[PDB]
Design a protein around this ligand. Structure first.
Ligand code: HEM
Ligand code: HEM
Ligand SMILES: *[C@@H]1O[C@H](CO)[C@@H](O[C@@H]2O[C@H](CO)[C@@H](O[C@@H]3O[C@H](CO)[C@@H](O)[C@H](O)[C@@H]3O)[C@H](O)[C@H]2NC(C)=O)[C@H](O)[C@H]1NC(C)=O
Ligand SMILES: *[C@@H]1O[C@H](CO)[C@@H](O[C@@H]2O[C@H](CO)[C@@H](O[C@H]3O[C@H](CO)[C@@H](O)[C@H](O)[C@@H]3O)[C@H](O)[C@H]2NC(C)=O)[C@H](O)[C@H]1NC(C)=O
Ligand SMILES: *[C@@H]1O[C@H](CO)[C@@H](O[C@@H]2O[C@H](CO)[C@@H](O)[C@H](O)[C@H]2NC(C)=O)[C@H](O)[C@H]1NC(C)=O
Ligand SMILES: [Mg+2]
Ligand SMILES: [Mg+2]
Lengths: 236, 236
């Protein structure tokens, strides 16, 4: 145990991402959530989850745009709405109507109740969850943003939790609820529950067919202009 | 001084930006134009031009998206169309109809002929030049992309040449043609011609009103859907 879970203190920076928060809570990233570069993310995601540099370099550099520093962020910076952070999250509220940063059990209810009768979440349950979370945002949020880009990011995130928290073969696109629930609710690797780091590297080619299938099953259409413009920096 | 101009060799990476290419030609950045990080850009831009970290961090991190590396680029990477690189450049051709990378004297005619009768370029001539370059792209390039984002970037780039190549007070928003011409044609600081690095720091608050006036005077309107989506990575 060079990497025990410790609950974050009130001054440790944490963001809207359970993947990065969990790595910080285990000391793979700095426990203070500060001064985190793309090379640090690449190493931490590799050591923690066997996630490879292809997706971590791509996502990491987009995430860097959310801070004012030359080559690092604080995890909380990633909450910046419209860079990566988006409406119809699995476990956070939409920023126009709530808190887009912290885990929120009420929001998480959709995911937690999904795939009724099974002990795993899987590609079809993820797609249904996405459909129902988006419908919620569309019903309740007058400023909802829902575009090809946010839809792809959302499927990427579902594919992330299905593969990183799997019971050992991430190709299957399924993960025990008991692992995924601990991941979201505690931002802890569920080691005592029996989870282990994937022995298969999790790469863009591995994720891509999972992402596409989730989208396909999600009965999705875009909203409004459908323009994939992102926010390129914090307020100037 | 210690930073002499040398022409780039065949293997020295150079991009579509005369600002960075010039820094590399004088060794403020690596002469080979490779392994360049945002902290390197921030330091070279300060040393070479007295351009401050606010604008270099903001633009630098967007530029980092153009490579496949965790935290560096080669200068040539910045040619990636639709991240920063755009149609209706001052000195390059649009990618759909030509070479969007190298200096091009025929394209440069519009700038080189602007502000007739005067010895400087200034805010109104920069605006007229942007107008006419965009008009050329609208005429000749069926694939033209012209959005709020590309217009802002273009005005920023004109504000850059006016300020950085000024006769010593960047607030004036004017620059001797002799200096600006050497800057674009040779990617050389025009030292023997009489230019010296600004003693006034060039910052976002200094540039903003110059950028806005350039746009205001340019008689500009968006094209097509006006969606400011950028390309977030080179080919996956
Ligand atoms: C290391 C592997 C990673 C995993 C397993 C992971 C997992 C996830 C998951 C499951 C979500 C969805 C949370 C929700 O909808 O409630 C998410 C959200 C997010 N992730 Fe990651 N992530 C990882 C890496 C990254 C990286 C490298 C970045 C950027 C530097 C990033 C930035 C975000 C952001 C901004 C969100 C918020 C999107 C939203 O729900 O609005 N993540 N992540
Ligand atoms: C250091 C101060 C800088 C100066 C004085 C400067 C100046 C300029 C100028 C005048 C252009 C217009 C070229 C044309 O229209 O033909 C331009 C283009 C460009 N600059 Fe910079 N620049 C600077 C910094 C940067 C930085 C930090 C980046 C990002 C890493 C960047 C990326 C670009 C790109 C991609 C273009 C091509 C846009 C186009 O014309 O299509 N520049 N630069
Ligand atoms: C994700 O897991 C869910 C739940 O295990 C899978 O959905 C389930 O699929 C089974 C097999 O198709 C369904 O039962 C089959 O059900 C039919 C009639 O409903 C019955 O005639 C067959 O004898 C068999 O029992 C089941 O209804 C269905 N359950 C739910 C909750 O949807 C799903 O296939 C998995 N998805 C993936 C991509 O692995
Ligand atoms: C950018 O430089 C331009 C060229 O120097 C300049 O345009 C010029 O503005 C001058 C000054 O007002 C005008 O000069 C006029 O002065 C007499 C009276 O003293 C008038 O009766 C004449 O109309 C004469 O034009 C010029 O008209 C004009 N020259 C050119 C070639 O356009 C811009 O004002 C400068 N822009 C900025 C923002 O500084
Ligand atoms: C490491 O990150 C920390 C936290 O973001 C940085 O500390 C901040 O620095 C900014 C820049 O001035 C300050 O305005 C904040 O007030 C600081 N925050 C705290 C909590 O002290 C720090 O600069 C970074 N370290 C390095 C070497 O860049
Ligand atoms: Mg969100
Ligand atoms: Mg161009």
């Amino acid at each position: 145990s060079a990497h025990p879970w410790k609950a974050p203190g009130p001054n440790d920076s944490r963001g809207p991402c359970p993947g990065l928060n969990t790595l910080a809570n285990h000391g793979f990233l700095p426990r203070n959530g500060r001064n985190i570069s793309v090379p640090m993310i690449v190493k931490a995601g590799f050591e923690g989850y066997n996630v490879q540099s292809d997706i971590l370099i791509l996502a990491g550099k987009i995430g860097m745009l959310t801070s004012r520093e030359a080559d690092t962020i604080s995890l909380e910076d990633l909450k910046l709405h419209g860079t990566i952070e988006h409406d119809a999250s699995l476990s956070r509220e939409d920023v126009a109507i709530g808190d887009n940063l912290h885990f929120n059990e009420a929001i998480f209810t959709t995911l937690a109740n999904s795939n009724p009768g099974a002990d795993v979440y899987n590609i079809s349950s993820a797609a249904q969850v996405q459909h129902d979370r988006l419908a919620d945002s569309l019903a309740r949020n007058p400023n909802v943003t829902n575009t090809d880009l946010t839809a792809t990011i959302r499927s990427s995130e579902s594919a992330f939790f299905l593969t990183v928290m799997s019971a050992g073969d991430p190709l299957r696109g399924e993960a025990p609820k008991k692992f995924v629930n601990v991941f979201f609710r505690e931002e802890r690797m569920p080691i005592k529950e029996g989870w282990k780091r994937s022995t298969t590297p999790i790469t863009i080619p591995l994720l891509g067919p999972i992402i596409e299938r989730i989208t396909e099953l999600s009965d999705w259409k875009p909203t409004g202009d459908n323009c994939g413009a992102i926010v390129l920096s914090p307020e100037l």
